[PDB]
Write a sequence for this structure.
């Protein structure tokens, strides 16, 4: 007797989860910060 | 006594939202109107903060 329990995609090791978590980027936050500073600099230029 | 609480919650939400919106809008209009500014201009310094 084997596979008394069916797999639930839980074979993923904690180390693999650790590598995946730190892998996925978050540059979109940098993009939003860049857009906000762009808006502020555009207003400053509009000062002229 | 079970749906009355939900009705009161909705009433409080609506009252808070409406009062806050009216007051913020009127305060903003008062701060902006006599200032008589235009978007993307030099004078709107305080505006750089306000909006």
């Amino acid at each position: 007797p084997h596979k008394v329990d069916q797999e639930f995609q839980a074979a993923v090791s904690k180390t693999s989860w650790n590598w995946l978590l730190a892998l996925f980027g978050g540059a979109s936050s940098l993009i939003v910060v860049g857009l906000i500073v762009l808006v502020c600099s555009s207003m400053l230029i509009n000062t002229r | 006594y079970t749906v009355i609480v939900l009705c009161g919650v909705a009433l409080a939400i609506l009252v808070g939202t409406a009062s806050s919106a009216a007051c913020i809008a009127k305060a903003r209009r008062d701060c902006l109107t006599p200032y008589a500014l235009a978007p993307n201009a030099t004078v709107p310094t305080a505006l750089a903060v306000l909006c």
Remarks:
- Chain B touches chain A through four residues (CB under 8 Å).
